[PDB]
């Protein structure tokens, strides 16, 4: 594997790590979700272009579409949470325990 593939995979790992390690703002985590989607898009596009798989050229576009549905979903939830607390802090989501 060339250095570009490892750079893309490292980008995905950094974003996943960013998602997993929460700070305070919910939106900061939605941004890491978007970054994971972007890294997947670039990785799959590079693999598809390199092997000249013509039909697969439509799959990153599809991959983009469901990226928006996931973002629009998340932002929707971020609205409701904010409407309850006046803040998007994940500390407030502690009504339910394990």
């Amino acid at each position: 594997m060339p250095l570009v593939y490892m750079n893309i995979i490292m980008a995905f790992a950094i974003a996943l790590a960013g998602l997993l390690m929460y700070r305070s703002h919910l939106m900061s985590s939605l941004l890491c979700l978007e970054g994971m989607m972007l890294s997947l898009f670039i990785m799959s596009t590079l693999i598809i272009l390199n092997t000249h798989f013509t039909l697969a050229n439509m799959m990153p576009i599809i991959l983009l579409v469901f990226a928006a549905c996931e973002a629009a979903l998340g932002l929707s939830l971020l609205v409701m949470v904010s409407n309850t607390y006046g803040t998007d802090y994940v500390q407030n989501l502690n009504l339910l325990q394990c």
Binding site: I61, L64, V65, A67, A68, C69, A71, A72, L75, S76, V79, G86
Partner: protein, 115 residues
């Protein structure tokens, strides 16, 4: 390679203009002069306070509608296929569902800003 040179040239020109703007004239900066502007009176609160979005649902909807232009942008190349009957059915199907999405949001009062 030519486009990279063009981008570098444009950014360099803009940055040089900023540098001339900041290093040529005589600066006399003092506290009253650098204070925030609100029409002559000091601001009450911070400008970093939450500023409500009344079009928040249109903004979320714009995300989905923006992704549909990505699906419709390859249409010029799709008109060159032999299965024009299948292609035209799919193109119209995508635009009908796009219009139906707008019809649902419109009728259910989704395009009205919150008060």
């Amino acid at each position: 390679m030519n486009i990279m040179l063009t981008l570098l040239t444009n950014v360099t020109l803009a940055s040089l203009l900023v540098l001339i703007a900041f290093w040529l004239p005589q600066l006399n900066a003092y506290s009253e002069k650098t204070s925030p502007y609100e029409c002559g009176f000091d601001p009450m609160g911070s400008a970093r306070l939450p500023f409500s979005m009344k079009f928040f649902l249109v903004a979320i909807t714009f995300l989905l509608f923006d992704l549909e232009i990505a699906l419709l942008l390859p249409l010029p190349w799709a008109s060159q296929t032999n299965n024009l009957k299948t292609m035209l059915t799919m193109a119209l199907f995508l635009l009908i569902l796009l219009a139906a999405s707008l019809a649902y949001e419109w009728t259910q009062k989704g395009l009205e800003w919150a008060e």
